[PDB]
Design a protein around this ligand. Structure first.
Ligand SMILES: O=S(=O)([C@@H]1C[C@@H]2O[C@H]1C(c1ccc(O)cc1)=C2c1ccc(O)cc1)N(CC(F)(F)F)c1ccc(Cl)cc1
Ligand SMILES: O=S(=O)([C@@H]1C[C@@H]2O[C@H]1C(c1ccc(O)cc1)=C2c1ccc(O)cc1)N(CC(F)(F)F)c1ccc(Cl)cc1
Lengths: 10, 235, 228, 9
């Protein structure tokens, strides 16, 4: 999915 | 939410401490610039700035309280506005120039590089000039940048939560102004002046997104998957 | 210069007196309905509204103190924002609907009759919802509309005269809120709330134009457009 | 520009 999600979670 | 319990001084200190670092441009290529090399440098810089922006945002009081999806939405809406107000801020003591990075300071002559960047260039310069003449303070700037994050996507959606935090930042702006010695009239007058500049920052971002979208289609420079995702959200 | 001597009550009086009328559309409820015809009606309406807006602008304190050149620039920059805030204002008492004209009330249904207008529709609806939530007053509305006129093109001197008029309107907004019993803290908060909505109205105007360049247009509208 | 005639009228 979106990279942004990942960057937000960690 | 812990953010509403903060005092104004505590809010300021938290926002100052949350500030991202100032990144450097690639040191190659250097001046002069082509449309390809210019966009290449700016794209590379913006991509690295985004990573710090995301970690800055999770440190803005109230932001962590939102669902992941709402967090994504706000950052997707506001990211170019936030990069731009940052650029205008660090360009303030360089009148007539834009300090994209300490090793990448540009004038509008270099703006014709990839039209219509010159139009946006001039808008950015005008905003920097306005901030400088208003003697905008760092404490005021971090409040404004946080307002952009929380406000820019709020009507494209608790929204009450975001609005309570926004009120808290308004309280903080006034608090900063009062202790700078401004009268009651000067206080609400400068508050209005600052917030109206935010509509111009929105305008610049909108025109900027268009440009980046055209660049995507022109395929002059490969964009990062992250930048494409941030961009696609505005299509 | 006459603008700088107005008390806040006099400013409000002046803006209220200057208000344009609410125009009717040519909508026929029997008549059938096309993407083109819908846009046709709205274009016909906006064009007539523009005439009133131009003559309204001349009555906004400070505006006649500017050159023909600067007046043209401000209106070119602001006209869609101004039509939009007007629309959002008269749609306040109609949840989920946009009152384009007294005889033209639409929800997001036939907003989809036009490609991409649905996006702008939803944004306009959200703004109307926000005004309704805040219980926006008529006196506050006319202040906001005048701010849009003076502010939207100001960053593309008489630019400083404009900032002084804008400051006056800010004073006027605060005075209105103090009269409604708001505490000083509540006044500053509401002022900020109102002005942040102006960022969204700018956003809506820009997105509208972008979709436009992605319809029939009157000669006056055309003159305004290739100002963007 | 029509805008002129309307502004000047
Ligand atoms: O294309 S433009 O709108 C846009 C705005 C400015 O230049 C373009 C741009 C930019 C952003 C992303 C990108 O992939 C390329 C360029 C800017 C930028 C601003 C601040 C910052 O810290 C980093 C980059 N001119
Ligand atoms: O922004 S749009 O939605 C616009 C907003 C709203 O609906 C569209 C529209 C409208 C305006 C002018 C016009 O010639 C046709 C339509 C509206 C309107 C608003 C207030 C008012 O008093 C009268 C009309 N739009 C985009 C579109 F083309 F997809 F529809 C738009 C934008 C610019 C112009 Cl010139 C025309 C339409």
């Amino acid at each position: 999915h979106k990279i942004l999600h990942r960057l937000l979670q960690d | 939410s812990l953010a509403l319990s903060l005092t104004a001084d505590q809010m300021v200190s938290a926002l100052l401490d949350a500030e991202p670092p100032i990144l450097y441009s690639e040191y190659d290529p250097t001046r002069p610039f082509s449309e390809a090399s210019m966009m290449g440098l700016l794209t590379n810089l913006a991509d690295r700035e985004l990573v710090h922006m995301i970690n800055w945002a999770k440190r803005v009081p109230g932001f962590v309280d939102l669902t992941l999806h709402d967090q994504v939405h706000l950052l997707e809406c506001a990211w170019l506005e936030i990069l731009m107000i940052g650029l205008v801020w660090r360009s303030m003591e360089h009148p007539g120039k834009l300090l994209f990075a300490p090793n990448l300071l540009l004038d509008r002559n270099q703006g014709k590089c990839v039209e219509g960047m010159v139009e946006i260039f001039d808008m950015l310069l005008a905003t920097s000039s306005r901030f400088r003449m208003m003697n905008l303070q760092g404490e005021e700037f971090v409040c404004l940048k946080s307002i952009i994050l929380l406000n820019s996507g709020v009507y494209t959606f608790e929204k009450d939560h975001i609005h309570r935090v926004l009120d808290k930042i308004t309280d903080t702006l006034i608090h900063l102004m009062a202790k700078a010695g401004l009268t009651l009239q000067q206080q609400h007058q400068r508050l209005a002046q600052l917030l109206l500049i935010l509509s111009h920052i929105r305008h610049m971002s909108n025109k900027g997104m268009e440009h980046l979208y055209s660049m995507k289609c022109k395929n002059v420079v490969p964009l990062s998957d992250l930048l494409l995702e941030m961009l696609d959200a505005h299509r």
